[PDB]
């Protein structure tokens, strides 16, 4: 017997103590080592309700990631309200590592194992664990990177699909690689991401078909973001310590999704990106300025494992639904990895 409860979790990781990489450094002091042989127990004939959208594990991960960034990614200048902080801003080593979240004594984590569980409601196949799987704290917009994949079908998650003010998370069942490069030796801030067009359009087609199931077979349309700061109108992420902004107009290109045999739908899709020194902080604390990019080839090869979407509002839309990349906030990135977990207190 038990009941849903909130408590202070602790983290575990395989961080390297001698490493200068900032995630390793944070985790060496903030987390304990991993349990070699973790215990998992199927709970027979147990049904349990989950809600990924009201899950306090998410708040705790958020605090941790904010704290990691606060002590690892100091800007040269920080502009908050009327306070101007000019500090030092050395280039760092940056590459996220898996972090496990673990319950204390008296508590345990219940884990949903239903192959197509959508994040809310009853789970039929439930087990108990002491820690979650290893979650990389990847901060990105629009595209979810280096995450875990849905086990069977593509899955659509939302607190309310009919609610245009609620974020939609698409969880992919097959990853698509995005290869982002800032070459050496012409602006030093100019960069680009390559994506296999054949591979991407196949997946996006499956996503549209999945959305058709939820929206009454209506015509499904993708469009670019309607507005907002560049962090959200573009695919924004951090590669090797540098802040990338990539234009995703070409990824959401209805032309190639109609399945129409069309020219150039195959082959390499090249997105234009910029490395920016002046950024708005995702932590919500105004503008920060950093030093110019390091010299040499800057390269990040990531797996796209998910997509955040917002759906266009307006009553009587009758014939179609339009979705634009980007949605919600960075907490939703953690929700996409924590959706199948919840904490309970053993009584």
């Amino acid at each position: 017997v038990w009941k849903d409860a909130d408590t202070t979790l602790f983290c575990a990781s395989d961080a390297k103590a001698h490493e200068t990489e900032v995630h390793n450094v944070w985790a060496t002091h903030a987390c304990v080592p991993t349990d070699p042989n973790p215990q998992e127990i199927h709970l027979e004939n147990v049904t349990e309700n989950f809600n990924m959208w009201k899950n306090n594990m998410v708040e705790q991960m958020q605090e941790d990631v904010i704290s990691l960034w606060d002590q690892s990614l100091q800007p040269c200048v920080k502009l908050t309200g009327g306070s101007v902080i000019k500090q030092a801003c050395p280039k760092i080593s940056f590459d996220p590592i898996p972090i496990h979240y673990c319950t204390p004594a008296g508590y345990v984590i219940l884990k949903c194992n239903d192959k197509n569980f959508n994040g809310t409601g009853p789970c039929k196949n439930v087990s108990s664990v002491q820690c979650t799987h290893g979650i990389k704290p990847v901060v990105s917009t629009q595209l979810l990177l280096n995450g875990s994949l849905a086990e069977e079908e593509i899955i659509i998650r939302s607190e309310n699909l009919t609610n245009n003010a609620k974020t939609i998370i698409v969880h992919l069942n097959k990853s698509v690689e995005i290869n982002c490069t800032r070459p050496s030796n012409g602006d030093i801030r100019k960069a680009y991401c390559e994506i296999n067009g054949t591979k991407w359009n196949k997946v996006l087609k499956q996503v549209t078909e999945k959305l058709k199931e939820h929206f009454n077979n209506k015509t499904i349309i993708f469009q670019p973001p309607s507005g907002g700061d560049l962090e959200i109108t573009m695919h924004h992420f951090n590669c090797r310590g540098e802040f990338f902004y990539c234009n995703t107009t070409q990824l959401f290109n209805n032309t190639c999704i109609g399945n129409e045999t069309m020219k150039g739908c195959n082959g390499t899709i090249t997105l234009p990106c910029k490395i920016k020194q002046i950024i708005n902080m995702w932590q919500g604390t105004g503008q920060a300025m950093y030093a110019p990019p390091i010299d040499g080839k800057i390269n990040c090869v990531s797996n796209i494992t998910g997509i955040l979407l917002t759906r266009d509002g307006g009553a009587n839309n009758t014939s179609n639904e339009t979705f634009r990349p980007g949605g919600g906030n960075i907490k939703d990135n953690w929700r996409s990895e924590l959706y199948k977990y919840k904490v309970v207190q053993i009584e």
Binding site: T162, N163, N164, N216, G313, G314, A315, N316, T318
Partner: protein
């Protein structure tokens, strides 16, 4: 995509009466429905959120209930200040509204007709006005006849809000035609139909 059917479209009740309005949703919506009050010339005011939670400050006479597809808003003991339009909301879609009115004893309108002024005719236009004063209920019909010829399309009217004390309405109808069209016919008549009348009423004048 959702469709909310709000009913009735209008109602009238005496002070202290119980009034309820319903909204039916074309699809299950759980409890995601809010209710608003809007008075003439003012912004809406939230009364109830999440189907049944009464908002702070709102008088205790108001209540909402329902879930899934059937939702209601109730005013126990209607008050003068409750005269308003009420409507439900489900995300960006609103119900068509319900105009609440205060019920009084039926009252026929005093009808008056005003010919245009000599001053106005100099400008080449002629406005004839028919006034209906202090009647109830608000529904009323007005037709213009010019030499027994039913006048259509050249007419506009305006109605006042329900009066505070006597709970009555007033309406004006204005007939617009050219100066030339005015100096052609002799008899101008305002024909009124209202419940408080056993039979239609006609006020008229001879151009002269």
């Amino acid at each position: 995509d959702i469709q909310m059917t709000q009913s009735p479209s209008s109602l009238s009740a005496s002070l202290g009466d119980r009034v309820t309005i319903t909204c039916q949703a074309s699809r299950g919506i759980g409890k995601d429905l809010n209710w608003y009050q809007q008075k003439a010339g003012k912004a809406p005011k939230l009364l109830v959120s999440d189907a049944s939670t009464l908002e702070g400050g709102v008088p205790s006479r108001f209540s909402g209930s329902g879930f899934h597809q059937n939702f209601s808003l109730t005013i126990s003991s209607l008050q003068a200040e409750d005269v308003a339009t009420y409507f439900c909301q489900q995300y960006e879609t609103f119900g068509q509204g319900t105009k609440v009115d205060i019920k009084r004893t039926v009252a026929a309108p005093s009808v008056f007709i005003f010919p245009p002024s000599d001053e106005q005719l100099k400008s080449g236009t002629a406005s004839v006005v028919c006034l209906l004063n202090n009647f109830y209920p608000r529904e009323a019909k007005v037709q213009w006849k010019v030499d027994n010829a039913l006048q259509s399309g050249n007419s506009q009217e305006s109605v006042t809000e329900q009066d505070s004390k006597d709970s009555t309405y007033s309406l004006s109808s204005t007939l617009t035609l050219s100066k030339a069209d005015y100096e052609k016919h002799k008899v101008y008549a305002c024909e009124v139909t209202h419940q408080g009348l056993s039979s239609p009423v006609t006020k008229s004048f001879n151009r002269g």
